[PDB]
């Protein structure tokens, strides 16, 4: 059982808190989704290797440029999140987050994650986005962004339905183990 640290980064409502909660809680939050995530050490066995994966959130730190980098020391894998219902949050991936993560985390694998993929088929989401000339983030626009920023990989998930959530965390463990 080796120890690895995972830190999730991304804009305000990119769904990173919801994702850490839904993965860490073996018990779906049917009654109340917590506002905050403290920390968690997950027991993961990926490709036959047992790893203790410490999970950390950066929510609440987005406006504080000196407090935020205190989350980065000894990170083994970064999950870079964006919301598929917010193309604006994707535009900030190369200009703001990627340079910060490459500066404080040299050579740490980054997995670009598109959260809330279920909103791609939501009537209210498409109707609202079209009001500001937008549309849900397309799978290829996510892949191209991951490609451009030099990400280890591109993955999509849905914290609401749990689809693809376990695959993100097992893949991030494989990324953390690579040297």
């Amino acid at each position: 059982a080796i120890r690895k640290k995972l830190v999730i980064v991304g804009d305000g409502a990119c769904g990173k808190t919801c994702l850490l909660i839904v993965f860490s809680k073996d018990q779906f939050p049917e009654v109340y989704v917590p506002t905050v995530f403290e920390n968690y050490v997950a027991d993961i066995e990926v490709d036959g290797k047992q790893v203790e994966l410490a999970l950390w959130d950066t929510a609440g730190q987005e406006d504080y440029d000196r407090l935020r980098p205190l989350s980065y020391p000894d990170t083994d894998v970064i999950l870079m999140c964006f919301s598929i219902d917010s193309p604006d949050s994707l535009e900030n991936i190369p200009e703001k987050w990627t340079p910060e993560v490459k500066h404080f985390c040299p050579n740490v694998p980054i997995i670009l994650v598109g959260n809330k993929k279920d909103l791609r088929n939501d009537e209210h989401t498409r109707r609202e986005l079209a009001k500001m000339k937008q549309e849900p983030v397309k799978p290829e626009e996510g892949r191209d962004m991951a490609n451009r920023i030099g990400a280890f990989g591109y993955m999509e998930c849905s914290a609401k339905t749990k689809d693809g959530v376990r695959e993100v965390f097992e893949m991030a463990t494989r990324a953390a183990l690579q040297a």
Partner: protein, 244 residues
């Protein structure tokens, strides 16, 4: 933590902590407000308990079992006594507000209607000034504390043995030295998120919506002040690196 408070905050929400027949008597908007208020207290209980692991388990255990050079323990645990006094006072006020609000004959059914005043007191004047100065100190010594822990774990066999020993219990899985330090740094940035969501369901009484709005602004003034006061200390830094 103490058993009484742990049982009071063991449920996943306020809607699950109170008796089912007491919940049925309240409007949804109230249930939603009480859920976020309950989360603010439950996470404050956990915060204070994280600081007790640092002071009573790590800090004191090191002083009584190890023979470290004076000042190494303080470098590992900056401001932990001051942080423990600030947060233990805050937690006492929150738990008493909940206690006062209990129905007679019950130890678990309550509705906290007034919270804004308590948050304005905690995040204004002297108490806020002490908290601003303590968190600027703590976060400037955060990196150094981690460098110091790593240095000691990789060089001292006895320190390594002490850590393995006290961190072995399953209840300590998320609470090693390094984790406790990041837990404390991250706490301050949780308050605006919780208060904003409490405010989102506190529009029923205007004095309350106004008090929670003032409290939110005070917590952000404090956060902006702590962020501005931060300057990372380096373990063994040279004067020339500091003045350039």
């Amino acid at each position: 933590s103490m058993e009484m408070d742990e049982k009071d905050f063991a449920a996943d929400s306020w809607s699950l902590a109170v008796d089912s027949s007491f919940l049925q008597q309240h409007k949804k908007e109230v249930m939603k407000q009480q859920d976020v208020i309950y989360e603010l207290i439950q996470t404050e209980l956990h915060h204070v308990r994280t600081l007790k692991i640092m002071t009573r388990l790590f800090r004191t255990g090191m002083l009584e079992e190890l023979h470290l050079e004076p000042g190494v323990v303080q470098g590992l645990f900056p401001c932990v006594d001051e942080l423990s006094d600030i947060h233990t006072r805050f937690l006492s006020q929150l738990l008493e507000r909940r206690r006062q609000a209990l129905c007679p004959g019950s130890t678990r059914n309550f509705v906290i209607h007034r919270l804004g005043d308590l948050l304005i007191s905690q995040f204004s004047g002297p108490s806020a000034e002490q908290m601003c100065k303590t968190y600027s100190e703590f976060c400037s010594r955060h990196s150094k504390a981690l460098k110091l822990y790593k240095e000691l774990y990789a060089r001292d066999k006895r320190f390594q043995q002490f850590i393995r020993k006290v961190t072995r219990p399953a209840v300590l899985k998320r609470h090693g030295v390094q984790e406790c330090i990041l837990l404390v740094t991250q706490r301050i940035t949780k308050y605006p998120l919780l208060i904003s969501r409490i405010l989102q369901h506190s529009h029923g009484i205007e004095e309350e919506r106004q008090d929670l709005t003032t409290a939110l602004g005070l917590v952000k003034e404090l956060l902006s002040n702590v962020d501005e006061g931060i300057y990372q200390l380096e373990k063994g830094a040279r004067l020339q690196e500091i003045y350039n």
